[PDB]
Amino acid sequence: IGIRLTLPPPKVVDRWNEKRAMFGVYDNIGILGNFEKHPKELIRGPIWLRGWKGNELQRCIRKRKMVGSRMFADDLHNLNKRIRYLYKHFNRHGKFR
């Protein structure tokens, strides 16, 4: 019974809307623009992970470091608890040593 009895409404994807059509433009802004701008400066997203990558523990440390003072009280409490938990997990649990 975990099966729907009617076909879902058709999903129409416009492969040539402006976003898809211009996707990727200026990804070579650096190598084609005398390196005035790095491609990572094209990244739009959270301030604490623009042009940066890491596992969850590193992400949480960076988030607290960069916007921790602007976080809501309970969100910051949750972040501190998450950092503590992830520290314990990554430094004390696991198959490998």
Partner 1 sequence: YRARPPPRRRPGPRWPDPEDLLTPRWQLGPRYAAKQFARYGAASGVVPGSLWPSPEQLRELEAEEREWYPSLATMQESLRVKQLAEE
Partner 2 sequence: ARALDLLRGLPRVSLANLKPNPGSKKPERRPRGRRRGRKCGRGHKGERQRGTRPRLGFEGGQTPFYIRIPKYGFNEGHSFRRQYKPLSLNRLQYLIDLGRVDPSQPIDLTQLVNGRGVTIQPLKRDYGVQLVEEGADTFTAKVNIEVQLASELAIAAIEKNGGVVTTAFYDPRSLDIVCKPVPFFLRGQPIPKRMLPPEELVPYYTDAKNRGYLADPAKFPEARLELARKYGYILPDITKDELFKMLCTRKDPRQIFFGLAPGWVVNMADKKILKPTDENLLKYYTS
Partner 3 sequence: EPVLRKVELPVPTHRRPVQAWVESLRGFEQERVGLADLHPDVFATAPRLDILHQVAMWQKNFKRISYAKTKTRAEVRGGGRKPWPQKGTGRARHGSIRSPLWRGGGVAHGPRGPTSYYYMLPMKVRALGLKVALTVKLAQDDLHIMDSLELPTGDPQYLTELAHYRRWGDSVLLVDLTHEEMPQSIVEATSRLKTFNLIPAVGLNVHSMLKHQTLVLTLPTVAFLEDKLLWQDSRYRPLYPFSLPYSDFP
User: Helical H runs in 22-72?
Assistant: 56-67
Stretch that binds partner 2, among 6-14, 46-54, 66-74, 88-96 (CB under 8 A): 88-96
Cβ 29 vs Cβ 42: under 8 Å: yes
Per-residue binding string, partner 3, 37-56, x by CB under 8 A, is --xx-xx-xx--xxxxxx-x
Nearest to 83 by CA among 53, 54, 67, 63: 63
Q: Which residues bind partner 3 (CB under 8 A)?
A: 16-17, 20-36, 39-40, 42-43, 45-46, 49-54, 56, 59-60, 63, 78, 81-82, 85
